[PDB]
Amino acid sequence: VRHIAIPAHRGLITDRNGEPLAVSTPVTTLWANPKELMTAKERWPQLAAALGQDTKLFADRIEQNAEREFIYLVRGLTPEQGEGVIALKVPGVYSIEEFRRFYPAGEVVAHAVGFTDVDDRGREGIELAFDEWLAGVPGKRQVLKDRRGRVIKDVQVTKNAKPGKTLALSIDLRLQYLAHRELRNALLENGAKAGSLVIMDVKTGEILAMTNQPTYNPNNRRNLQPAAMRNRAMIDVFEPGSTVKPFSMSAALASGRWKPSDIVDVYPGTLQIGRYTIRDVSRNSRQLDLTGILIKSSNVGISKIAFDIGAESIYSVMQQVGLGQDTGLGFPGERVGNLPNHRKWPKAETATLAYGYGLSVTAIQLAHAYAALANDGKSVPLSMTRVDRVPDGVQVISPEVASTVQGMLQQVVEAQGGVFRAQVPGYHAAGKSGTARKNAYRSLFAGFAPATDPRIAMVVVIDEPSKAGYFGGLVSAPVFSKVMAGALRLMNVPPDNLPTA
């Protein structure tokens, strides 16, 4: 070896407003030339001590490497700690200036941002996804050494290091902190195993927050529990159950065959389909209108609509809003779930599609589909980076149908017998609860606000709540209420439901 590499300064990662999320910090690595150390053995114990190493094990290491001209002693010290050991003047001890990431927000955005390894290479999250952008390129310095490997000098910088480039995420750290706190709070209030919360800008496709529990502090490389390192919002797939009923309803309203005031008879709350029985969560209904089917969350009601309009129409809307489909994000480990298709849809599969059973999605997909509904039926491609020019997007549901469904979902939140815990102080909001039997349950709420001129969509997933209440409208709805109330205020959306008159 006639060169040493010159590490490049890795690009700053910020939130959408320039708040630092991953910052390259100076550290110093110490290395030694055993051939030189072998001439200076009386110094070894002082050096061993400086390095926190056992005297005899350190001596054993040097002796075993006596034929080598390079070994690492320790990596990633503070500059001051490194200078401290260099100041001992032990022959054959040298230092290299390197970088280590610091993550100022720690566990709050750990799953989005990810982490680098000891060599400063991205290995999880955004650090990995945008590694090429962030990394820049190392330089090279030619060195002169004697025949024992003693470093005499730097001869010159052959190649200069090129710094990596700054990256501004879509995340709004203010919203990320709020979501993080409120998801953690709800997890603890419910004794739950895990959860995720996603907030999206419905107009721009930006992911404004994406938080999961459990989480981890990426600044601390000890312990490390891989289960806490899971970006569940992107990696965990789940059956969305009742939260997809608004897409079934969109298909119904688009077919020409259904209007909101139409009635379906769901008595006696079960419906036999050959060997399979559809069963409603509550079984105290006969006639329901279409908004009532959503309020009551009736699997029987949505199934009967599905039989009438056919599964193909429902599958198309779900596919178009992105359920079970690749997001087109860069993101390491992201899963796609599954939206089943059929050459010919049998009756059972038509019903189960319509109420979200036996298909699987991620929280990011579900939030993206709600964002399309909220954005007057126009889907904008997802982004984990700040969006300055908004892409054109794709009109997936007709604006009229989107408008009608928005209004129904506002009634789901606001009407008698609805999901009152999702109501957002100061604002009209809209959305739909779900509960999936995995007994072990996952509690869901998906929605957007304000209900007119929607601005943000949100999905809350609470995995295995362990108190007697486990329904999405009980467990996840209040998290939507609190997080939406804070997020809208932070975004300076004027309240559209303050008390009047």
Ligand X SMILES: *C(=O)[C@H](CNC(=O)NS(=O)(=O)n1nc(-c2cc(O)c(O)cn2)n(C[C@@H](O)CO)c1=O)NC(=O)/C(=N\OC(C)(C)C(=O)[O-])c1csc(N)n1
Which amino acids are annotated catalytic? 242
Min. distance of Cβ 197 from ligand X in angstroms? 16
Q: How many residues bind ligand X (CB under 6 A)?
A: 22
Candidates 491, 374, 479, 484; CA nearest to 425 is 484
Whole-angstrom distance, CA of residue 109 vs CA of residue 231: 10
Tell me: does residue 433 bind ligand X (CB under 6 A).
yes
Residue 437 sits in the site that holds ligand X (CB under 6 A): yes
- Per-residue tokens: 500: 């009047």
Q: Which of 212, 423, 435, 481 binds ligand X (CB under 6 A)?
A: 435
The nearest distance, CB 414 to ligand X, in angstroms, is 12
58 contacts 48 by C-beta, under 8 angstroms: yes
**Scanning residues 353 to 382, which ones bind ligand X (CB under 6 A)?**
356-357
481 in contact with ligand X (CB under 6 A):
no
Q: Is 271 in the site for ligand X (CB under 6 A)?
A: no
Q: How far is the CB of 365 from ligand X (least distance, A)?
A: 15
Distances 460 to 121, 172, 304, 394, 484 between C-alpha atoms, Å: 32, 17, 28, 25, 11
Binds ligand X by CB under 6 A, chosen from 436, 451, 459, 487: 436
Give whichever of 230 and 432 is closer to ligand X, judged by the CB atom. Answer: 432
Q: DSSP readout, 115-135?
A: -B-TTS-B-SHHHHHTHHHHH
Stretch that binds ligand X, among 164-172, 255-263, 392-400, 432-440 (CB under 6 A): 432-440
> What are the phi and psi torsion angles at 7 (to 5°)?
-55, 145
Return d(Cα 436, Cα 244) in angstroms, integer. Answer: 12
Describe the strand order of the beta sheet including 151-159 as a list of residue ranges: 3-6, 139-145, 151-159
Q: How many residues does the chain have?
A: 501
User: Which range binds ligand X by CB under 6 A, 69-77, 365-373, 393-401, 413-421?
Assistant: 413-421
Least Cβ distance, residue 442 to ligand X (angstroms): 8
Report if residue 465 touches ligand X, rule: CB under 6 A.
no
Stretch touching ligand X by CB under 6 A, among 44-52, 235-243, 369-377, 391-399: 235-243
The residue (of 220 and 282) whose beta carbon lies closer to ligand X is 282
C-beta atoms surrounding 187 within 10 Å: 21
Decide if residue 282 touches ligand X (CB under 6 A): yes
337 near ligand X, rule: CB under 6 A:
no
Q: Figure out which of the listed residues 11, 34, 164, 241 binds ligand X, where binding follows CB under 6 A.
A: 241
DSSP sequence for 259-316: -TT-EEE-TTSEEEETTEEEE-S----SEEEHHHHHHHT-HHHHHHHHHHH-HHHHHH
CA angle 130–132–136, rounded 5-degree value: 125
Interface ranges with ligand X (CB under 6 A): 239, 241-242, 281-282, 297, 299, 356-357, 419-421, 433-437, 441, 471-474
